[PDB]
Design a protein around this ligand. Structure first.
Ligand SMILES: N=C(N)c1cc(-c2ccccc2)c(CNC(=O)[C@H]2CCCOCC2)s1
Ligand SMILES: N=C(N)c1cc(-c2ccccc2)c(CNC(=O)[C@H]2CCCOCC2)s1
Ligand SMILES: [Cl-]
Ligand SMILES: [Cl-]
Ligand SMILES: [Mg+2]
Ligand SMILES: [Mg+2]
Ligand SMILES: [Mg+2]
Ligand SMILES: [Mg+2]
Ligand SMILES: [Mg+2]
Ligand SMILES: [Mg+2]
Lengths: 5, 233, 233, 5
């Protein structure tokens, strides 16, 4: 998963 | 600019229509026009500004990452300049969008923002758009770009801690993004993890003060902090 | 145009990169530049052209439908001109894209296309982009726009029936789109259903001649014909 | 569902 912003 | 002849209220109305039509470049142009009318922005209007440019730059960033990966593999491979040229084209367009947003913040959204909610919002955006510039930076000024992002995030954090409850959704999204800044821009993964954990825990302890609807808003952002912690640990 | 200084091969390479980056406006500009070099297009290059403009105009059409629906509800309601103005803006941009594509076909892709596969491809595209113009047309020229779509589709159908097997994927996609033209532009739902059924049945009877990979390509498009039949009956 | 093209 790609980190969240 | 091209929106100088349109009423402020008409620009805001059309920004909302463009959002419904997923026409985010139009949305951003309409909100740029609204900002340039010179009046402060309401909470709703600040969100429209943020949503529009988030989506515009988000598409550019995603494209830049695709092209950068292709370029990297080409430099490991059978050989021309086209990949680099087209990555540069997208990069330059992305930098232009970031410069436009930073220019709106500097002329004159930040200096006229006196309330904590507005000032923190705009300083967070300043950190975000210097961060996007940092993602593609490589030259003499990369360190100054990073420090500009840091400085804006730090001032926003200082105000938010003094003036907002730990469950405030703007405070939480600020901390989320400053944490990601630490992790992948500043090469400070421990600071990133520490900030995400302390932010999460201090929000949890304040949830008891909230209405059902505020509770939903805060816990949504707390889950993003938890997602990153799970990814990073 | 802006692409006159770039090599044809570099334009094609960058169109493929733009596709990978989901940068379809760039993709379309690169393929427009390639067409304007004046040389015929290969099968792969024709597909790149079609994919690029399909995605550009597809976003505009979807936005136009959102705005048209909002406009319709506003004309049933509390009253300004903004919805109409912004629908008109999107509509004009959409018409400009359709005019650009039709202009490439007319100068000079169609007249230089001698093979059935290329000629049918371009005439299908001509029908498609007059159809998109017809979707938003309302004035003195709506009937002529519709007849221009019909005429292009009909010439493509005539050639495809004479020169291509009934499982050819371009023949099948042509029939799919001409069927939708009948259903929702020409107000001929029975013609639409008849064409989709006859196309499906004649393809099914030719599947036995195909390789495994061709079979997959043909049956994919046959399922779209079946989907429409299921929707319409 | 929307018809297919
Ligand atoms: N058009 C848009 N995209 C938006 C308009 C408004 C809006 C703001 C004020 C008044 C009216 C509408 C938005 C509020 N934003 C949020 O994120 C929500 C969840 C997270 C924390 O805040 C609570 C609300 S989003
Ligand atoms: N970059 C793109 N989007 C494409 C490039 C090529 C291509 C064409 C010729 C040679 C090399 C590549 C495409 C072929 N199109 C299709 O639809 C496929 C399924 C339907 C029927 O045809 C069979 C193939 S799509
Ligand atoms: Cl380029
Ligand atoms: Cl408008
Ligand atoms: Mg006024
Ligand atoms: Mg550069
Ligand atoms: Mg440690
Ligand atoms: Mg040359
Ligand atoms: Mg019009
Ligand atoms: Mg009947």
């Amino acid at each position: 998963r790609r980190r969240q912003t | 600019g091209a929106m100088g002849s349109m009423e402020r209220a008409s620009l805001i109305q059309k920004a909302k229509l463009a959002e419904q039509a997923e026409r985010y470049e139009d949305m951003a142009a309409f909100m740029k026009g609204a900002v340039e009318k010179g009046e402060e922005l309401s909470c709703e209007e600040r969100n429209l500004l943020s949503v529009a440019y988030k989506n515009v730059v988000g598409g550019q960033r995603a494209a830049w990452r695709v092209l950068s990966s292709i370029e990297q593999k080409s430099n490991e491979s059978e050989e021309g300049p086209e990949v680099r040229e087209y990555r540069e084209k997208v990069e330059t367009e992305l930098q232009g969008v970031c410069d436009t947003v930073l220019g709106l913040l500097d002329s004159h959204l930040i200096k006229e923002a006196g309330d904590a909610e507005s000032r923190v919002f705009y300083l967070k955006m300043k950190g975000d758009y210097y961060r996007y510039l940092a993602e593609v930076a490589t030259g003499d000024d990369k360190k100054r770009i990073i420090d500009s992002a840091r400085s804006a995030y730090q001032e926003a954090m200082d105000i938010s801690k003094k003036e907002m409850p730990p469950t405030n959704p703007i405070r939480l999204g600020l901390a989320l993004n400053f944490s990601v800044f630490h992790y992948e821009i500043a090469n400070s993964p421990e600071e990133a993890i520490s900030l995400a954990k302390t932010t999460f825990d201090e929000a949890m302890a304040d949830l008891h003060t909230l209405s059902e609807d505020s509770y939903k808003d805060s816990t949504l952002i707390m889950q993003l902090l938890r997602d990153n912690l799970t990814l990073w640990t």
